[PDB]
């Protein structure tokens, strides 16, 4: 990877970039014919939001997602991991990938509510004041429809709407 350091010496600023250590993909993928990191390791349909060991490889130090052109993921898998990372952040499973705060900023205390499988952003959702009849019930989404094809070990399929 490449870093950038800004140093001000004698009323003069010097901008430089250095190449740091870069991690390498593990040798001998079980499926060399695979076209992306996911299918090269037979991971398609076999990872979830809480698989941070997988998810953490495709995000930036501050929690941002990495471009698809750099990681090599396909559009389908890149979108699945994108949703998985949002749910991982909301679940509190990435405590060392928090947003960068400018000097002098200390967030004010906010109510702590444990949550998981959170599709939407908390602030953008309204209460369900009118539930509606049984034949037209307003449902609360749980999980993501992108993961509908994940391997199901139970006879009941994933319920995405509660």
């Amino acid at each position: 990877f490449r870093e950038v350091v800004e140093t001000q010496e004698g009323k003069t600023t010097i901008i430089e970039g250095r190449i740091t250590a870069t991690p390498k993909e593990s040798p001998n993928p079980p499926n060399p014919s695979g076209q992306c990191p996911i299918c090269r390791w037979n991971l398609k349909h076999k990872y979830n939001y809480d698989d941070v060991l997988l998810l953490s490889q495709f995000i930036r130090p501050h929690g941002g997602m990495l471009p698809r052109k750099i990681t090599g993921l396909c559009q389908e898998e890149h979108r699945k991991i994108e949703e998985c990372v949002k749910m991982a952040h909301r679940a509190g499973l990435l405590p060392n990938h928090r947003p960068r705060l400018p000097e002098g900023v200390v967030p004010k205390s906010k109510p702590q509510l444990n949550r998981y499988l959170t599709r939407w952003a908390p602030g953008s959702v309204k209460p369900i004041y009118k539930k509606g009849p049984r034949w037209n019930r307003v449902r609360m989404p749980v999980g993501s429809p992108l993961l509908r094809d994940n391997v199901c070990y139970s006879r009941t399929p994933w319920k995405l709407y509660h």
Binding site: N28, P30, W41, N42, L43, L54
Partner: peptide
């Protein structure tokens, strides 16, 4: 050290 069907 990974078989053809190995999955992490």
């Amino acid at each position: 050290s990974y078989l053809p069907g190995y999955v992490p």
